[PDB]
Structures are given as structure tokens and as C-alpha cells.
Amino acid sequence: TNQLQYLQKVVLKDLWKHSFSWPFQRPVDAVKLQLPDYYTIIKNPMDLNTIKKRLENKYYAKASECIEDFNTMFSNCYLYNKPGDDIVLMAQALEKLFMQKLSQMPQE
Numbered sequence: 001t002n003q004l005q006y007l008q009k010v011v012l013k014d015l016w017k018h019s020f021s022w023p024f025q026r027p028v029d030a031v032k033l034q035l036p037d038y039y040t041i042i043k044n045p046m047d048l049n050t051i052k053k054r055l056e057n058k059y060y061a062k063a064s065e066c067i068e069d070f071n072t073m074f075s076n077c078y079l080y081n082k083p084g085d086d087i088v089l090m091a092q093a094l095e096k097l098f099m100q101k102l103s104q105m106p107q108e
């Protein structure tokens with residue numbers, strides 16, 4: 001499970017420390033953001049703290065399941081929001097950081 005550890009102590013920790021990560025450190029707050037339809041049209045909401053808890057709890061069976069949750073977090077954000085929105089620019093920078101750290105994942 002060395003790929004799942006790299007995802008926890010490297011990929012997740014490096015995304016979390018990144019400047020743009022705080023909007024993604026909890027599930028999208030539909031009350032604070034005033035989004036009556038968010039949890040209606042976004043079928044698989046995802047956030048960095050959910051990924052953190054699932055890694056700590058050994059919820060994932062293989063690295064690809066956790067990687068998919070990371071991708072779902074980015075695509076939910078692109079999907080719901082609009083081109084050029086601040087949050088979308090933040091998602092993209094975090095996704096680039098995500099992809100470049102997947103570059104260095106031990107292929108085990």
C-alpha cells in the first residue's frame with residue numbers, strides 16, 4: 001500500500017499546505033455559499049478533509065480509488081462554477097500540483 005501512503009503523507013499534505021487549498025478543506029457549504037441546488041446536481045461531492053479521513057480510516061482499497069476522489073473534487077468545481085471564476089482558477093492550480101506530484105508516485 002505504498003501508493004496510498006504517498007497519497008496521504010505527500011500528495012495530500014502538499015495540496016493542503018498550498019495557498020489556494022482552504023476552500024477545499026471542507027465539503028462545499030451550501031448554506032454559507034447560498035447554493036440550494038448544489039447537492040442536487042452534484043451527485044458525488046468531494047473535499048480534501050473527506051479524502052484525509054478516508055486515508056486515515058483505510059477506506060480505499062487501492063490508490064486509484066483515492067486518485068478518483070481527487071479528480072472528482074476538481075471536476076465538481078469546474079462543473080458547478082463558470083469559466084474564469086476565482087475558485088476555478090484555484091482548482092486548476094491545485095490540479096496541476098496534483099498531477100505533477102502523481103508524476104513522482106512509486107509505481108509499485
Ligand SMILES: COc1cc(C(=O)N2CCC(N3CCN(C)CC3)CC2)ccc1Nc1ncc2c(n1)N(C)c1ccccc1C(=O)N2C
Nearest residue numbers: 022023024027028029032033034035076077078080081087
Ligand atoms: C464561506 O465560504 C466561502 C465564502 C466566500 C465569499 O467570499 N462569499 C460567499 C457568500 C456571498 N454570496 C452572496 C450572494 N451570492 C448570490 C452568492 C455569494 C458572497 C461572499 C468565498 C469562498 C468560500 N468558501 C468556498 N468553499 C468551497 C468552494 C467555494 N468557496 N467556491 C467559491 C464555490 C462557490 C460557489 C459554488 C461552489 C463553490 C466551490 O466549488 N467551492 C470548492
